[PDB]
A paper describes a structure:
The majority of traits controlled by rhl transcription factor RhlR depend on PqsE, a dispensable thioesterase in Pseudomonas Quinolone Signal (PQS) biosynthesis that interferes with RhlR through an enigmatic mechanism likely involving direct interaction of both proteins. Here we show that PqsE and RhlR form a 2:2 protein complex that, together with RhlR agonist N-butanoyl-L-homoserine lactone (C4-HSL), solubilizes RhlR and thereby renders the otherwise insoluble transcription factor active. PqsE is a thioesterase that triggers transcription of the RhlR regulon through a hitherto cryptic mechanism, which we identify here as involving a significant chaperone-like component that enhances the stability of RhlR via protein complex formation. In common with many other gram-negative bacteria, two QS circuits use N-acyl-L-homoserine lactones (HSLs) as autoinducers, namely N-(3-oxododecanoyl)-L-HSL (3-oxo-C12-HSL) and N-butanoyl-L-HSL (C4-HSL), which are produced by autoinducer synthases LasI and RhlI and activate the LuxR-type transcription factors LasR and RhlR, respectively.
We, therefore, investigated whether both proteins engage in a complex when affinity-tagged variants are co-expressed in E. coli. This was indeed the case but required the presence of the cognate autoinducer C4-HSL or of the synthetic RhlR ligand mBTL. The PqsE segment adopted the same dimeric configuration as in the free protein but with a slightly twisted arrangement. The RhlR sequence displayed the expected homodimeric structure of a LuxR-type transcription factor and C4-HSL as well as mBTL were found in the anticipated ligand binding site. The acyl chain of C4-HSL points into a hydrophobic pocket of the ligand binding site in RhlR, again with high similarity to related structures. This pocket extends beyond the butyryl group of C4-HSL and is not fully closed towards the solvent, explaining why ligands such as mBTL can be accommodated without obvious changes to the structure and suggesting that RhlR could sense other HSLs as well. The butanol-m-bromophenol group of mBTL resides in the hydrophobic acyl-binding tunnel leading towards the lactone binding site, and the m-bromophenol establishes π-stacking interactions with Y64 and Y72, two residues also contained in wildtype RhlR. The synthetic HSL analogue mBTL has been developed as a RhlR antagonist, however, using pyocyanin production as a proxy for RhlR/PqsE-mediated quorum sensing, we observed that mBTL induced similar levels of pyocyanin as exogenously supplied C4-HSL in a ΔrhlI mutant of P. aeruginosa PA14, suggesting again that stabilization is a key factor of RhlR-mediated signaling.
Residue numbers in the entry:
A (entry chain C): 1 to 241
B (entry chain D): 3 to 241
C (entry chain B): 1 to 301
D (entry chain A): -2 to 301
The structure:
Amino acid sequence: MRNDGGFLLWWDGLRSEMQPIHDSQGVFAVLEKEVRRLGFDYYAYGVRHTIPFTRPKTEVHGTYPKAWLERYQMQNYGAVDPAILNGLRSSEMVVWSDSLFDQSRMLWNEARDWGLCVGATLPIRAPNNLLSVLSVARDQQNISSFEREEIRLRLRCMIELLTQKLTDLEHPMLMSNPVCLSHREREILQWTADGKSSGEIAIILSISESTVNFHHKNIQKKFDAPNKTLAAAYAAALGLI
Amino acid sequence: NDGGFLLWWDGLRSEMQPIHDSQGVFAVLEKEVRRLGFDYYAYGVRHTIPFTRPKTEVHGTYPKAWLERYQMQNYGAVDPAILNGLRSSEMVVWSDSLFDQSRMLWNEARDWGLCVGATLPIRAPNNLLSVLSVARDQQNISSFEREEIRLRLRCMIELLTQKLTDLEHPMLMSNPVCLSHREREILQWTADGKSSGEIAIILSISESTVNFHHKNIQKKFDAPNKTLAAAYAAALGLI
Amino acid sequence: MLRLSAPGQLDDDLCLLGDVQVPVFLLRLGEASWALVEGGISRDAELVWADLCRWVADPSQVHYWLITHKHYDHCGLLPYLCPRLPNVQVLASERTCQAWKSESAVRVVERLNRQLLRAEQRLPEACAWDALPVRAVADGEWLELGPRHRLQVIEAHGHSDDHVVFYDVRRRRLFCGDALGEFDEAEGVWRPLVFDDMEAYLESLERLQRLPTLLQLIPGHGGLLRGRLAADGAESAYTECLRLCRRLLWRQSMGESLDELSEELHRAWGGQSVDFLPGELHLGSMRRMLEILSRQALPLD
Amino acid sequence: QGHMLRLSAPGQLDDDLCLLGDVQVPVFLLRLGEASWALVEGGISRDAELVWADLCRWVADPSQVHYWLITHKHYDHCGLLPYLCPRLPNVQVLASERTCQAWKSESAVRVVERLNRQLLRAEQRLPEACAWDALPVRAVADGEWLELGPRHRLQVIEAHGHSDDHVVFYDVRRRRLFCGDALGEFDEAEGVWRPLVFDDMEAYLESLERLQRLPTLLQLIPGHGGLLRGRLAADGAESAYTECLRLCRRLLWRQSMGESLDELSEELHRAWGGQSVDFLPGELHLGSMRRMLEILSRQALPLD
Ligand SMILES: O=C(CCCOc1cccc(Br)c1)N[C@H]1CCSC1=O
Ligand SMILES: O=C(CCCOc1cccc(Br)c1)N[C@H]1CCSC1=O
Ligand SMILES: [Fe+3]
Ligand SMILES: [Fe+3]
Ligand SMILES: [Fe+3]
Ligand SMILES: [Fe+3]
């Protein structure tokens, strides 16, 4: 490599620097290096899962002050954090601003207290219905427009490549829930999530209804689910069907 | 002073913001595609349901006859270029290996001159799978231009999905169902595995009320039971 | 090498005809279709037709002639060669054709072209200006010249109030004329050539930076550039233009006159264009460019 | 004060700053308080008796000089320390740990002493000098805040590239940057920067990159030429970056034609050396040109 002679050069150099990495810590280290090269002090990477629908897990990892992590998770500020929630509605980056935080005043005041006074956040959705987010933050310099655009591009590239590499390394933060369905069980669930009953599936797949209900039981067992509705809903939310 | 590519990005944005009609958006897309060196392009939206027969709508500039053929044989179901997006966010350069699973489609596309091309996927913020393809006939994708292209296509499709959502295109539109906070929270609880009685307990209402609410929800989806409602709501990002 | 600099074929399709100083470019659109670019001068016609004979078997198959702008060193062959390629459409911007319709502009061009003949050369046959086979083109127009030649026109005002450039999207090849400047053969950097408007010059370089990464960059003087030189061509030209701006502003803040830097620039640069540009016009053009820059440059505090 | 864009005369420069000695190799004086002062840049040896004179015009007591800031180790930015520190009892020298340790390394200080002994005026009489390892030094680190005075809070910033130890000082209250040689030698005749890359180009460019990010500058003070202001000082870092890449382009082109390093070194010397004849033997200037061209040919991105 990442250097000077053009944007494409920095892109290819970053890729080549990240290819040999077989340890997640080094991936995050390269990311931090480039973030500081951009001009900011801290960064963060968050993953919002879709379930549980009432309290969807939002896992986080970054380089904000550890005390701020303690406070953030203690009071579960991660649930209704505007920087993360913008990604559910938009593919555009969000520059931190008082107007954006009008709904969550306590969080913004505490973050300002910890030095996170200026920053930005970019969302992108993984091909498995996950909401990944990349935030950068500094203390004293406001984001000018031209630098806003520069950031948007560089952060997009960085987060895309980061999620790619973390999927290739099977990080626990992204692993969500390791569930594999067999071809038969997956198609049975496809039919069930389309509204078919045990008998209609038995007819269509040319198998018995007892077999179909036992497949349902296995599927439930994998999802740790009490009925078919939870299995179907979580499978639809996870992109398994 | 931060990359000459930034200039192209700024120019494209400035060109596409003042447009309030989708036809011009697609026209600008064609302009940039041809400026890169390709002949035709395409933009596809794969919905998540029906899970067995998922809707695949498309808009682009391929010969109309090949469109007739494509929909006639429902190639949108098992198109490898589109299905790549279900598991990866990386660009796909057209290659025999990619099409080994669906040779008929690739053979016919080659017959129509679509011999070289690429396809880039992206996930809209509403669980829809949008994809952008470019194609030409005689020149293989060289290495350096492959990456340059990849980046440009990513930017273009991001801004395209944004602007078409801002323009409320029908192809991006999904099944129109609106729920209130109470029924939405009831469905959140049901999709978490709770029974009628447990939901009634938690919300401090009666179980008859909760099952009547279930009927309310089912009526909108044209659904036969609660499982279909929960699955379609999860797939649509409503809960 | 990194620079190509010779009459004859450039690559699998194109040829440079005549003088590399005032070259004319030849596109092979097909088995039996050809096109031209740049109108050159009178003085190299006698080199044109002959060197052309080494590549084209029949002159009648030239169908297009592209002209960047109205300067004498990129336009002056219309009396010489146009009459004998009868199926040709000249394609040019409204500005350029209109300049060709005014007697004053053609007189300036004719005098400046006459200044460059040898005391031995005789003039070949000549035709009129308003009889030319002309068709107006627009910014961004798509020229389906050939099956593998789809080129776009791009308005690049600044060097002149009419300059335009041509981008081959298939080969990522840009004919830029003078909109980037005069390539310094001894140093490898760009010499700004702002002879009408600086804001338009810089905005043109901006709009050109937006093209896909270039493989081949073809200015009006010096041949063809490849590799890095072609990729950051517009960026580097922009940078050198602003560098000259700062030099001029600094020198003026010390009390120096535009003559001070004009004479110095002539001394250090004019040697390159002595073959096709009278030295006094080089000094005058340096002064014109410095005047425009001093007019439109951003001041300091 | 003034309408001018460059202040290049001994005497007061701002409401707290003064330039002392020769404008070519200046020493800058900051008034931290009524009875507290600080110095910046170490200049050269042979100006010891000039600077001192100037210094005593402004300060009633040399004991009120409490801090002395040094950018790097090169002979031309530290040669006054051994001679004048004996007259400033209350002074702390502040330099980077690499620069601090250089003064301990016998060979380095010998190069310093030699090059600074070579720039005397016929019968110049050096005054007595103390040891290089006897200086009252405190090492500073990247990003440290130097609480020099109540209204003087300067940050240290690592600016490697010009040398393996170079650092610069940012007075954030006045948006003033003491940048030494990390941007280069300002061309007084043309108004552009002459790159001075004498250790590593990647680090030099990364440092200029980082300095571009600072708040818009109002005052830019390199090690040679005085103080720059206005729009000349605002885009100074970007301009240095640009000129360095321009020289890279020049070198790479000349080598693609088959030229040697020494040829372009001689050309650059012809066109530049005239400025630094007073405080730099021409042969060392030519050698530095050759060294910079070496580094550029090594680390510059090829064209293929
Ligand atoms: O960047 C985000 C989203 C991810 C937050 O990640 C965090 C939060 C706390 C500790 C750690 Br470590 C990471 N939110 C912003 C809102 C303003 S402060 C902040 O963290
Ligand atoms: O791009 C796609 C998906 C369909 C988008 O293209 C189309 C299809 C139908 C009508 C229109 Br208009 C454009 N598939 C690729 C696979 C290789 S050839 C091809 O078109
Ligand atoms: Fe011209
Ligand atoms: Fe010309
Ligand atoms: Fe130095
Ligand atoms: Fe120095």
